[PDB]
Amino acid sequence: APTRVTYRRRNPYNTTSNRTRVIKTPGGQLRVLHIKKRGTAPKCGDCGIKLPGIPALRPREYATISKPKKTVQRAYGGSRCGNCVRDRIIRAFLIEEQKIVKKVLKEQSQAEKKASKK
Amino acid sequence: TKGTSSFGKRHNKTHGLCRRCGRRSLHNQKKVCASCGYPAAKTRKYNWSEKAKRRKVTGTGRMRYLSTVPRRFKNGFRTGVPKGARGP
Amino acid sequence: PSHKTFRIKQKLAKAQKQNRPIPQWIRLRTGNTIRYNAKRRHWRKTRLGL
RNA sequence: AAACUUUCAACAACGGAUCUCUUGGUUCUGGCAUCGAUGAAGAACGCAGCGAAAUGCGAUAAGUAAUGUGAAUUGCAGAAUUCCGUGAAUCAUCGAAUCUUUGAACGCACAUUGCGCCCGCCGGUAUUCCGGCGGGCAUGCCUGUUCGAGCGUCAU
RNA sequence: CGAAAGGGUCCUGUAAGCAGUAGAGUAGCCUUGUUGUUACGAUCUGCUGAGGGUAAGCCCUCCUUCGCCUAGAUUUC
RNA sequence: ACGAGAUUCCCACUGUCCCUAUCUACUAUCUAGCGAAACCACAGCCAAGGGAACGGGCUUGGCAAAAUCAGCGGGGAAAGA
RNA sequence: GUGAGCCCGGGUCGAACGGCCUCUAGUGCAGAUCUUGGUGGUAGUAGCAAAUACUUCAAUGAGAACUUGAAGGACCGAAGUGGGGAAAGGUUCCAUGUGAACAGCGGUUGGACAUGGGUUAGUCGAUCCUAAGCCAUAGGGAAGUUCCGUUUCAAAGGGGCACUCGUGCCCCGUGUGGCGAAAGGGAAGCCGGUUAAUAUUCCGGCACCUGGAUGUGGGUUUUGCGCGGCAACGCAACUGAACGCGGAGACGACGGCGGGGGCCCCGGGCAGAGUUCUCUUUUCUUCUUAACGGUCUAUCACCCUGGAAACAGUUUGUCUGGAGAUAGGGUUUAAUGGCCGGAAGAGCCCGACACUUCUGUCGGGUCCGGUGCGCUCUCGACGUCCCUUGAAAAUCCGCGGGAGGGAAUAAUUCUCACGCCAGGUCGUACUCAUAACCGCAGCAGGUCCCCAAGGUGAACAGCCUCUGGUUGAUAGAACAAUGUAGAUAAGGGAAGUCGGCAAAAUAGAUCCGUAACUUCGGGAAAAGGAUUGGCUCUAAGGGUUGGGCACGUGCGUGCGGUUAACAACCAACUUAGAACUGGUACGGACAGGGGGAAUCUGACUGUCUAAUUAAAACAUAGCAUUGCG
RNA sequence: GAAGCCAGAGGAAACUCUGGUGGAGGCUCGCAGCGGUUCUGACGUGCAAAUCGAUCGUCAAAUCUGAGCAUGGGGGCGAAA
RNA sequence: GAGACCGAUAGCGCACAAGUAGAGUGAUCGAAAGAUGAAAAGCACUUUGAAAAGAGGGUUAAAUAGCACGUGAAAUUGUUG
């Protein structure tokens, strides 16, 4: 049984675009099959972790699948992870509360200064 | 090994074919023809090579238009047709 | 090579059509001096120069 | 004595001198003024019934029209020419035309027959899709037109 | 005379195969060991100075076989 | 420490040698076919003499017999000398 | 005729030429290592000796070592003399025919010569992107050919709205174009068959991508733009302009570990073939499953409960945890994994008939396991190194925002399913080399990659073999000298020679042992020793599965116990020990350090005089000086 | 067989010793590749205007190598011959 | 239109399919090569050879002009004396 194979395209060099795998055909013959590069998982824009629930594809393959498969049903879903979204929510709430507290303190200081001047 | 063994490494091309003069003199990296000087507007010629001038001078090709000018001058660049000639 | 441009392939086509011996009726013409193809090319002998 | 080597002679070889030839050079003299964006010179690729080249020509392609001449062309094939003629010819002349891809080369490019844009026309079921065809789109500058910009100078 | 063969003389070192109460041990079957037995197992022993070679520049053979023969061509006081 | 760097020595080792011999393959050799080049004034045995420290040709002697084959490296030739 | 020369006879031949006096010159040859052309001796000479090798019969033909078929013998030995490519060539490819020339011998053969034939794509490339870099434009130089310039000292343009003082107004800022990769980036095609010669291109079957138009079903909505899960997130859909954010594209080298495909290996079974003096339930061959999809699963990670010292979990490699570990239960990235569709109808193997050809026809099968420090590709989690930190752009997607647009005359501007339409141009033969490229050639040189079987062995070492290729390199005979290449030699053992040049000796592995010196790392395999075959045994080193009651009813509890320290099944390679046995040899071929004492010298690794010098030369780290805000 | 790590034995601790683990280095033997040390080597009108054989240096990197691109003679490039 | 020019190694490099063939990466470099006969009348037919060709027999004024072709020197070679 002939076990040795050839490239099926005219590129003879072992480059990153020249990836092959070995198949056995229904005709009983060993052959190569040119394959594409592996997809890369999308990553969170804050921490850089791999986003769960999102497929790992080459970039143009995302144009062929539907919206619920490309995202997570949550704010920033498919772009930021759940932990980072929770951190954003807590930080936003606490910073706005502190802004209100600082505004109240500044108004009290302004009123005290106005009373001292008057 | 500067001779025969070194000669086995000669498989690139310094010059390709020039679109203007047809010679294998178009430097593939400089994009300048060594013979006719393309893509400069003027054709390259020098007075230190009378032979090179005479290889490409007027009359060495076809003269598709210029060869008919002396006859038209001899008849005075006339227009029209002979009198009574068949036609429109 | 197998990879070639259109211009190169056109020149190779012209060379292939030129590569022939002269027709035998040429030698029977009146006052003929052509005895063979003096510009005949072979792939081993003289390079096309492309 | 033969063979061999050398010498002499005849004939035969080898080779291309000599002689004669010359549609070619060389030099002098006389005449003439005419390349190109109306796309030249040069390059490439093609074109004949049977051609690779030389020669001629450009998809109207060894050529078309017109004028003249007046019976060929010829290597083969095949046809002629009402010869008392809108007419043979690889004929001459040449005022009308055709003139592929290029090239100063001009939509942008060209180591690609790569990629465009604008306006028409035609065809395919077609207001949308597909295809084909035609005409266009370089730069500098001049005259003019028209649309503009700036408290630059003013009038109101 | 030639080709075989036979005999001699030399060279190597005991052929293939079969057999063996030879063989370290191991595993089965049963009389559960009394060559217990059968199987395998380098090797050993016997048949067996056996087998193989031997003139190619070894020897002998009218009397061990088979074949060949008085040519052909060239030249010569 | 490291080294295809230069040098001296010891053990082992051996045909380096005493001292040469033998075997194999490919050549050389012979045949069929195929078939160059270098080089070439003319040629090729010596001895003595040939003032210019040189003879192959001259003088005087020795001598001296066709045509050849394998080798050889004195001489002549032979070093992009 | 002194002579340079002149004249005549004879032969050959075919078209012009001569004497005399003047005129005129490119006017007289043995040399110039003269120029061009032609030809000898040498000479039938040197030679046609690397790459192991050829033989028999038959056919063809005038003719056969180098044509073909068969029969034998060999070689390459998977880093090939194999199967395919990039550069370069350009028809050398295939068929038919062939005088000469060429194939340093022959030739019926040929990559030669002659006439013809052959290269089929939306999916493979080019075409697109940008890299290093190159060239226009503005503008400035230069007598000028032109030089710089590529974001500039440029008025370098996009979008929206408008019924009114109708012939306007508003918004925005970033600049600037092009070329540049058949190995970088990148949308999409697989299997079977088919030709003399092409095939991921033709034919059949089965798919995919991109773009466009417009329907049907389904979805959503009277709570107008879905629902479910505590959550990680899920599900066939499930609005989303400007302007923004983010992700993908998109990335080093090396080390060990784990998963998957393929290959290699072992066992059983059907069928076929070979062996068969004897033995061999034997040795060998076929036993396959693509793209594209569905479905169930697969390390990391993440979520929930809960709160850990008697610290625990845990990798070959020591990391992780009150910033929440272990445990228990979940969610997800990731298939070249299992099953199913494709798909047995294909391919392959075997058999029985038919058959001038045309042509075939019909049966039977194509199954079940196992193993691994194996080889190769791929994926994953780790780790190491850096005064080195290991592209860009086209392109695609998600989100933030909420502009618009949206319903019961039903509406829909739904990234869901199905349906409709379209996909141009160019390359595509063959060689890729001891004959298709370069070296003047069919030149032992040189020239970038992919696939890579069995045995021995540590091993893509050497040696032998299978598939697939070759058997091509002038032949025949003889066996002198001298050679080239390979060997052996008694006794002595460097007496040889300038010089131990060359050869010989050593060599793998296990074990014992190992000095000075030292920058403490080395020296070191120092040195010096013991051993190694075959056979029959013994011992050691592993994996998987599996616990009693009481109830409810295969799971839930509440218990009870750590002799499972036991059984059943399965499996591979190492290591140690012992007896027996042959011996001149036991790493039996192959493969494979001679060792030591010192001196000089350059620190080391590295680099150069291609084609006479490889070194104390150069470089190097370290050190020192000088200049510059 | 370098750091790092595990265990055991000590030491008041810092540390010391022993056995493992681990897999560093312009480290080392060596195949391919790259290079080019030696041989009274082959060849010397050669297979070759630099080739052939054996031997040798290096072999995880200051290693080897393709394509694209840049530097052009008053020049370039130069681990400098 | 001419010449007290050259007459195929001359004369232009080129009298000819010459700026061709061929060489070089490239700029560039750059040949050799004319003559059957008045007319192809370029050898029918026979014969020997596989063929190339040979011999007869022909064509021609001449093949002592056979597409190696006018004439046909020398070097050098074969046969005969």
Ligand SMILES: [Zn+2]
């Ligand atoms: Zn995050």
Ligand SMILES: [Zn+2]
């Ligand atoms: Zn040009």
